[PDB]
Design a protein around this nucleic acid. Structure first.
Ligand SMILES: *O[C@H]1[C@@H](O)[C@H](n2cnc3c(N)ncnc32)O[C@@H]1COP(=O)(O)OP(=O)(O)OP(=O)(O)OC[C@H]1O[C@@H](n2c[n+](C)c3c(=O)[nH]c(N)nc32)[C@H](O)[C@@H]1O
Ligand SMILES: Nc1ccn([C@@H]2O[C@H](COP(=O)(O)CP(=O)(O)OP(=O)(O)O)[C@@H](O)[C@H]2O)c(=O)n1
Ligand SMILES: [Mg+2]
Ligand SMILES: [Mg+2]
Lengths: 717, 726, 146
RNA sequence: AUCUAUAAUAGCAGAAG
RNA sequence: UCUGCUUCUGCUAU
RNA sequence: AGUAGUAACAAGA
């Protein structure tokens, strides 16, 4: 017998065993070299889908920009970026007509959002392009560098702390004759065009650890001048998506499954009995490369009708900046000579003035096709969205096309509705016969073509209503469990012993709750997690023979302890977990069983493995000694000048927390400097203390004198 | 003193001074998150890659004086690193755990009291049997952390800020009396606390702040049942369990209302609703406690709870609840009908409108009122509240209760009548919630009328000002018991005089979900379950017993139709339809036993529950039959498969609402000729379209044909077929 | 031109405080110059109403040590509310629903200062009604001397 | 009965597009 | 010159 | 050589 696992589908429906088809036990594919190839190929595809558009030269950056809007209607079924503005405006108008007041209410909530949001929001980002260094940096570091450069250039509206004031600072920065960068101290001066190109740049990197793809692709990260505007636009689009029944966003998880099930259920209820009902499991092809920023500007302009003009402007800036964006090419390439046995790095900035003899066929073609767009090591990319930068606005566009499917708009016997999550979509078509179904599908496809949406024909299929797939959720008369997708969440997390126990047990319990993890498999998952935990942390049961550096101390503690069942697993104790007590932490689970001296040692108030805060008297520690801190190795470049800046930053922040007790519980607000706030707090505290009677004459005088000394030092350095 | 000298030291230098001066407080958080290095990624690999090393831990240098450099085996516990940090081995952690200074004062039980409450709830819990069953889990929002019953999340956070950080609350003021009481008790309980204020704040967040999540739930949705959801509810099994602590009375009241409504609804279908209802309440538990024992000691005001109390010879209130006020009808009657209305924000929605004149005593705690109303009309409202805010509360509640078109058109803004998961919300509750935040527009669009100044009372104006001249259109201000009942075989609750006080028709049709798990013990553990469970289990019972059911469907069909097993199904059928549906199905079955060769097991199984009603004659042909699931009418199509009942001819496994019901064996007398005798009333389907007999006409167009005549009908899901009139 | 006048009319510390006050809420001192002048006048009236007033070690007010007044105006919103909350938690005085301008330790009460261009009756009445707390002091000055 | 929300600390990890 | 955006979920508290 | 797969590693300073 030849074993064929796929033959199991001959009896078990594919949905009820979909977990088999997800091979998430092996490592995911990574990229190894540069991402310049994928970046250039993305730019060339974007300009190929819009090649019949109009070419112009940007008077501000000098970049060739392609405009495919209102271009010739497509003649074939290849992806097209030729969205018609009148069709997009009609889709918006009919979405507002079908849901009266959606855009007005969304604009009110977004006005509140825009007026209250702080600049600190921008620090909630991951790796960000930093134009001051022309490199990727943490979002908070990039924002701090931007604020420092803006301040040294006389731009200080961001001192208000509001995001919109920082956006005004960005707007004013885009009008300066020259930008001063002060490194460490080399004083560089960018001119208007160079600073402008750096401000409209999105750094490009290759996406790593991605399942389901044979070939790698490029992702983009914008700078700080783009992120605030994109945040405001995405907030407006999220407010809109929240009010739409077809939107699969921003709902996620169990709430998303419930919404999808209820909406599909209502759709099947609305469909009359004599009607034929079909469902398209549909993907859209080249979604981000055919989403035009000009159509996003049209959508925002229609959505913000009759709003204050400042609001329309601040919402219009993101599509404008994305219409004039530049894509940084990346790291370049690497060249090898076998005969000379040497290798060298060729930067991307010299890919326009390099000889094409060095490259293979396809890379030479890429460079030849992309050379007219190269400026300062970036490529002009007017069309496209550059990989999920306006997820919610493109969701709104897709939902508008879905909304165009009611019988009041089709004016025929067929109609359609469905679900839209950015690019993914489930389309339910109803019609009195099969010809009507075909006509409705053709009309939906062509209407999508009219707005720059291209249904992937090779990835989409259609069947009688009742089963479909939407955003990796498989629906067979109801959504099925897919446990494999949550498989990489099982294991030792690497935080510390306590946190790893908590995470392992909690993951097992939540997988029992959400992903149909059965009780026997849950017990076996518990056993496997305890094995992996004991291996990782060298904390095998005291009464064992495994030889490790920790085993002697564990044997001593084991033989020392009367009640062994109270010892934590990290202390070589037994595993008392079962299905009953997964929701209970480990220290609480066996608190009754602990020996008194072991319990008073594990939870000692003067625990030396956790940090202690001053009130040299300190607060008592509560955590156990298993909550230690892992050494983080961060030691070979020239970027070692920031280690001292960060150390002094930390010193200042600890002093501030000594003056402001709630600063680390909630984010502090204030336009005053740190010294001013701290001195005023010290003064008012000394006053209400001398008054209430905790300090005397002389201590109050001394505090007031030190405050006056600090204030004359801040005025007189 | 220390800190001000520290600040002066940093300002004496040059770079720290420039930092302290040229950095606002808002940018301090930015410079606080400011990091330098290559960040970090995939820490699990890092942990596996550093635990084999000698010193993977970083600690403060103070540990030099607490942990020795070497143990009794010469293994190094810490090593100096070229600063205040020091690299440390896990052997140091174990050496502290076995030799460190011990104490009798640990803070862990106090800081983590909620986890010990979970421990105590598990320790004193009671385990029942495990029942393997067809499980229907529904995704809904439930409480993961219950929090304080009085406070809301916002109020709890305000209390926590006031308790832990008094001088940092800003403009905020604690308004509620519960907020002030809990703040007083927490500030009293936390003096001379040796715990850092951050950890105290997080302990209070665990104690007070309510937290919710969307989860797939079966059984009780209360937090004491959600915390053990992994243990009690599985894919195919229910583990009977009762937590150890004390139950909240609110959850008991809610679950009692749910169980009573389910029981009354299922009892109305029985031929003896009184005995059926008594059997159900005798065979029902709510959170482990017997239902009859709850009914004898629970002062819950609800129609179905009062019917349950009356059937067991108890005193009832004959009252209900609405908008926080207790309503007691003093005179009048009413029926309930579905009415579609358009709101002020252009949202169409159906409301249960009560037709008939009636009068009510509406009692709150800070207000009280006499109401008189008709079909969507507030005839009279005499409020007698204490404060003008309570007066306004009672007025708003009465305007919403009246179901006036002025009230429905006063809706402004982004008022949603659906859930975030697109689930139907109660329209009346939504209107109340909308107008309780601001009812200015409602007060303007209500109307005014002049007062005659009778009895010395004074009327109120839309500006909440007392006026002797004019008032609202029917509103007047003023300056200011369990009865023995009977019940008959059909659950009509008469008084001592003889006038009807309650009826099953007054029971709310909303199918809710219990807070505490409801346990039913009988032949069918699903008899008083939700609609999805009832449908799945009805069809599963039909096909599980298909041998005797099939033998009985031919010998004595009347005996089969009368079985109790179909009565939970019949409570989901709309009442006005039941008889008609029954008649239809029965005629189908009869014309199925007359035509030899036409035997479809799937058709019989599909239509068998609908034949459980007294059959009313009709000439209507049904293409589908409606069952009420969660406020929506799901249609079971007479021919072919549907989304509530689909038979896979390949796997032979019937699927009901996505839940497997089981396989159908091979019937030798199955009809492969293609003829159908159980689709249309008085018509045999002989196959596909024959263009000889003309174009296709409608299902409801077939009533004028004559016997011995074929035709083409567009009967089904867009399927044209050829039928003939018998 | 108003800008220039303000820049030369008031002290640099008052001007800096006004600059901070209008910069906190997104107002340009170069654009909205009348609000610049109003805020400078408010700050100057407050810093003259406060200064040269102390309480000696026995407990009464002497004009020349424990300052008689606590300046609440001209602070950041957070620092102002911190001062107000600390005063309330120490002296046990009712918390004002809005930020006041001064606090009097001797009289133990929050002072709301107003500097009106129009009649003092109108302004005063309006402010009083808005506050609706019969505990906060309201002292209204005008440029006419009333 | 409602409850991303009559809501907003932050970081990390998993999944999805 | 190298883990982006968005959404959900879980854990933790420099 | 091998890993690997559209570009890299097969040490770097
Ligand atoms: O959680 C649900 C329920 O269990 C809970 N509840 C109900 N009763 C109590 C008591 N007594 N104590 C604590 N909690 C209680 O509140 C929720 C109500 O359930 P839900 O299904 O959401 O709504 P319900 O179907 O009960 O209808 P509702 O709008 O709440 O009205 C309740 C009651 O009011 C009657 N009623 C309304 N109107 C406008 C009426 C009218 O014009 N004329 C007459 N005669 N009655 C009217 C409703 O029919 C119900 O009887
Ligand atoms: N990591 C990710 C994955 C997806 N996305 C967003 O989702 C879209 C579809 O991705 P997708 O992966 O479905 C496109 P694919 O099907 O591979 O190819 P095709 O375009 O030829 O059809 C992208 O274009 C981005 O907007 C993202 O922002 N980050
Ligand atoms: Mg798809
Ligand atoms: Mg795809």
């Amino acid at each position: 017998m030849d074993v064929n696992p796929t033959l199991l589908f001959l009896k078990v429906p594919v949905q009820n065993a979909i977990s088999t088809t997800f091979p998430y036990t092996g490592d995911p594919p990574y990229s190894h070299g540069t991402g310049t190839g994928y970046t250039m190929d993305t730019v060339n595809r974007t300009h190929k889908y819009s090649e019949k558009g109009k070419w112009t030269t940007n008077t501000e950056t000098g970049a060739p920009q392609l405009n495919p809007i209102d271009g010739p209607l497509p003649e074939d079924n290849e992806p097209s970026g030729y969205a018609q503005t009148d069709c997009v405006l009609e889709a918006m108008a009919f979405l507002e007509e079908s849901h009266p007041g959606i855009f007005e209410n969304s604009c009110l909530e977004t006005m509140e959002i825009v007026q209250q949001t702080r600049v600190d929001k921008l620090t909630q980002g991951r790796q960000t392009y930093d134009w001051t260094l022309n490199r990727n940096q943490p979002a908070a570091t990039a924002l701090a560098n931007t604020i420092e450069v803006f301040r040294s250039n006389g731009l200080t509206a961001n001192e208000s702390g509001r995001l919109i004031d920082f956006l005004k600072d960005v707007m004013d920065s885009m009008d300066k004759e020259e930008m001063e960068i002060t490194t460490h101290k080399k004083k560089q001066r960018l001119n208007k065009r160079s600073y402008l190109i750096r401000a409209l740049t999105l750094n490009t990197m290759t996406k790593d650890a991605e399942r389901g793809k044979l070939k790698r692709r490029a992702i983009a990260t914008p700078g700080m001048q783009i992120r605030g505007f994109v945040y405001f636009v995405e907030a407006l689009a999220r407010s809109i998506c929240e009010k739409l029944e077809q939107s699969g966003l921003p709902v996620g998880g169990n709430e998303k499954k419930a919404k999808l099930a209820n909406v599909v259920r209502k759709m099947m209820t609305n469909s009359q009995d004599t009607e034929l009902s079909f469902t398209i499991t549909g993907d859209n092809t080249k979604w981000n490369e055919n989403q035009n920023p000009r159509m996003f500007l049209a959508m925002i302009t229609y959505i913000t009708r009759n709003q204050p003009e400042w609001f329309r402007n601040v919402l219009s800036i993101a599509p404008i900046m994305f219409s004039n964006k530049m894509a940084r090419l990346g790291k370049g390439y690497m060249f090898e000579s076998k005969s000379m046995k040497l290798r060298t790095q060729v930067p991307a900035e010299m890919l326009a003035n390099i000889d094409l003899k060095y490259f293979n066929k396809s890379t030479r073609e890429k460079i030849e096709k992309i050379r007219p767009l190269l400026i300062d090591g970036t490529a002009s990319l007017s069309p496209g969205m550059m990989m999920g930068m306006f997820n919610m606005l493109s969701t709104v566009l897709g939902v508008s096309i879905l909304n165009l499917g009611q019988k009041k708009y089709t004016k025929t016997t067929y109609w359609w509705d469905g679900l839209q999550s950015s690019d993914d979509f489930a389309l339910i078509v109803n019609a009195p016969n099969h010809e009507g179904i075909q006509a409705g599908v053709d009309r939906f496809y062509r209407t999508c073509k009219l707005v720059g949406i291209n249904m992937s024909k090779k990835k989409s299929y259609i069947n009688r209503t009742g089963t479909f797939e939407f955003t990796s959720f498989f629906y067979r008369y109801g959504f099925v469990a897919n446990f494999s997708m949550e498989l990489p969440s099982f294991g030792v997390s690497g935080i510390n012993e306590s946190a790893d126990m908590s995470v392992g047990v909690t993951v097992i319990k939540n997988n029992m709750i959400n992903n149909d993890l059965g009780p026997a498999t849950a017990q076996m998952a518990l056993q496997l997690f305890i094995k992996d935990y004991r291996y990782t942390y060298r904390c095998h049961r005291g009464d064992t023979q495994i030889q490790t550096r920790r085993a002697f101390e564990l044997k001593k503690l084991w033989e020392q302890t009367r009640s062994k069942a109270g010892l934590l697993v990290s202390d070589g104790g037994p595993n008392l977990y079962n299905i009953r007590n997964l929701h209970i932490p480990e220290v609480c689970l066996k608190w009754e069983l602990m020996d008194e001296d072991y319990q008073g040692r594990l939870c000692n108030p003067m625990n030396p493995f956790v940090s202690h805060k001053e009130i040299s008297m300190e607060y008592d520690a509560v955590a156990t000694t298993h909550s230690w801190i892992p050494k983080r190795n961060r030691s070979n470049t020239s970027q070692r000048g920031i280690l001292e800046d960060e150390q002094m930053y930390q010193k200042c922040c600890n002093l501030f927390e000594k003056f402001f007790p709630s600063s680390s519980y909630r984010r502090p607000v204030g336009i005053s400097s740190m010294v001013e706030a701290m001195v005023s707090r010290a003064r008012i505290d000394a006053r209400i203390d001398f008054e209430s009677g905790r300090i005397k004459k002389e201590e109050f005088a001394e505090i007031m004198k030190i405050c006056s000394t600090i204030e004359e030092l801040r005025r007189q350095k | 003193m220390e800190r001000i000298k520290e600040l002066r030291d940093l300002m004496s230098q040059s770079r720290t001074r420039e930092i302290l001066t040229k950095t606002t407080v808002d940018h301090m958080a930015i410079i606080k998150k400011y990091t330098s290095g290559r960040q970090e990624k995939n820490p699990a690999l890092r942990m596996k890659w550093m635990m084999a090393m000698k010193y993977p831990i970083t600690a403060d240098k103070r540990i030099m004086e607490m942990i020795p450099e070497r143990n009794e085996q010469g293994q190094t516990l810490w090593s100096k690193t070229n600063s205040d940090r020091v690299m440390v081995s896990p052997l140091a952690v174990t050496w502290w755990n076995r030799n460190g200074p011990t104490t009798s004062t640990v803070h862990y039980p106090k800081v983590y009291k909620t986890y010990f409450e979970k421990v105590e709830r598990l320790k004193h819990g009671t385990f029942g049997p495990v029942h393997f069953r067809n499980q229907v889990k529904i995704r809904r929002r439930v409480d993961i952390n219950p929090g304080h019953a009085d406070l809301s999340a916002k109020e709890a956070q305000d209390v926590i800020m006031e308790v832990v950080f008094p001088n940092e609350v800003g403009a905020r003021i604690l308004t509620s009396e519960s907020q002030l009481t809990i703040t007083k008790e927490k500030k009293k309980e936390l003096q001379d606390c040796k715990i850092a204020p951050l950890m105290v704040a997080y302990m209070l967040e665990r104690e007070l702040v309510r937290k919710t999540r969307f989860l797939p739930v079966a059984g009780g949705t209360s937090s004491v049942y959600i915390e053990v959801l992994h243990l009690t509810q599985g894919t195919c099994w229910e583990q009977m369990y009762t937590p150890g602590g004390e139950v909240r009375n609110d959850d008991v009241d809610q679950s009692l209302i749910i169980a009573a409504r389910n029981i009354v609804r299922r009892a109305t279908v029985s031929a003896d609703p009184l005995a059926s209802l008594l059997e159900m309440c005798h065979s029902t538990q709510i959170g482990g406690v017997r239902m009859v024992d709850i009914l004898r000691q629970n002062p819950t005001e609800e129609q179905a709870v009062d019917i349950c109390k009356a059937a067991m010879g108890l005193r009832i209130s004959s009252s209900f609840s609405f908008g926080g006020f207790t309503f007691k009808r003093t005179s009048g009657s009413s029926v309930k009908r579905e009415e579609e209305v358009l709101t002020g924000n252009l949202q169409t929605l159906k409301i249960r409108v009560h037709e008939g004149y009636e009068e009510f005593t509406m009692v709150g705690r800070r207000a009280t009122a006499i109401l008189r109303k008709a079909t969507r009309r507030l005839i009279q409202l005499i409020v007698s509240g204490k404060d003008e805010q309570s007066i306004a509360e009672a007025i708003i509640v009465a305007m919403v209760f009246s179901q006036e078109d002025c009230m429905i058109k006063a809706v402004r803004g982004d008022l949603n009548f659906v859930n975030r998961a697109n689930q139907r919300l109660n329209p009346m509750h939504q209107l109340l919630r909308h107008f309780q935040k601001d009812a200015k527009v409602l007060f303007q669009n209500w109307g005014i009328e002049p007062i005659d100044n009778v009895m010395g009372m004074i009327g109120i104006l839309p500006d909440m000002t007392p006026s002797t001249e004019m008032s609202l259109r029917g509103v007047r201000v003023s300056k200011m018991e369990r009865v023995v009942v009977s019940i008959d075989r059909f659950l009509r609750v008469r008084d001592q005089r003889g006038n009807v006080l309650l009826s099953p028709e007054e029971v709310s049709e909303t199918q809710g979900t219990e807070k505490l798990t409801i346990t039913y013990s009988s032949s069918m553990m699903w008899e008083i379950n939700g609609p999805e469970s009832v449908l799945v289990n009805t069809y599963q019972w039909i096909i599980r017993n298909w041998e005797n059911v099939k033998i009985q469907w031919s010998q004595d069909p009347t005996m089969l139709y009368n079985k109790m097993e179909f009565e939970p199904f019949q409570s989901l059928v709309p009442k006005a339809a039941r008889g008609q549906y029954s008649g239809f199905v029965r005629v189908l079955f009869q014309q199925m036993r007359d035509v030899l060769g036409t035997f479809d097991t799937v058709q019989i199984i599909k239509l068998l529950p609908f034949a459980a009603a007294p059959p009313e004659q009709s000439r209507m042909q049904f293409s589908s039959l409606t069952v009420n699931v969660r406020g929506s009418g799901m249609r079971i199509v007479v021919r072919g498969n549907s989304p509530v009942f689909n038979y896979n001819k390949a796997t032979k496994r019937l699927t009901v609402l996505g839940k497997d019901a089981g396989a159908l064996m091979e019937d030798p007398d199955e009809g492969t000729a293609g003829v159908e005798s159980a689709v249309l009333r008085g018509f045999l389907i002989l196959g596909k379209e024959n263009k000889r007999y003309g174009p296709a006409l409608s299902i409801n167009e077939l009533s004028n044909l004559a016997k011995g005549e074929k035709a083409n009908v567009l009967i089904g899901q867009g399927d044209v077929v050829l039928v003939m009139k018998r | 031109g108003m800008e220039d006048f303000v820049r030369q009319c008031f002290n640099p510390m008052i001007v800096e405080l006004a600059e901070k006050a209008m910069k906190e809420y997104g107002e340009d001192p170069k654009i909205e110059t009348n609000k610049f002048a109003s805020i400078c006048t408010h700050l100057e009236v407050c810093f003259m109403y406060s200064d040269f007033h102390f309480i000696d070690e026995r407990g009464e007010s002497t004009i020349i040590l424990k300052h008689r007044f606590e300046i609440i105006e001209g602070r950041d919103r957070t620092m102002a509310w911190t001062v107000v909350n600390s005063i309330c938690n120490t002296t046990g005085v009712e918390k004002p629903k809005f930020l006041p301008d001064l606090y009097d330790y001797k009289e133990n009460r929050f002072i709301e200062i107003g500097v009106t261009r129009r009649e003092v009756h109108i302004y005063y009445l309006e402010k009083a009604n808005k506050i609706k707390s019969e505990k906060t002091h309201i002292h209204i000055f005008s440029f006419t001397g009333e």
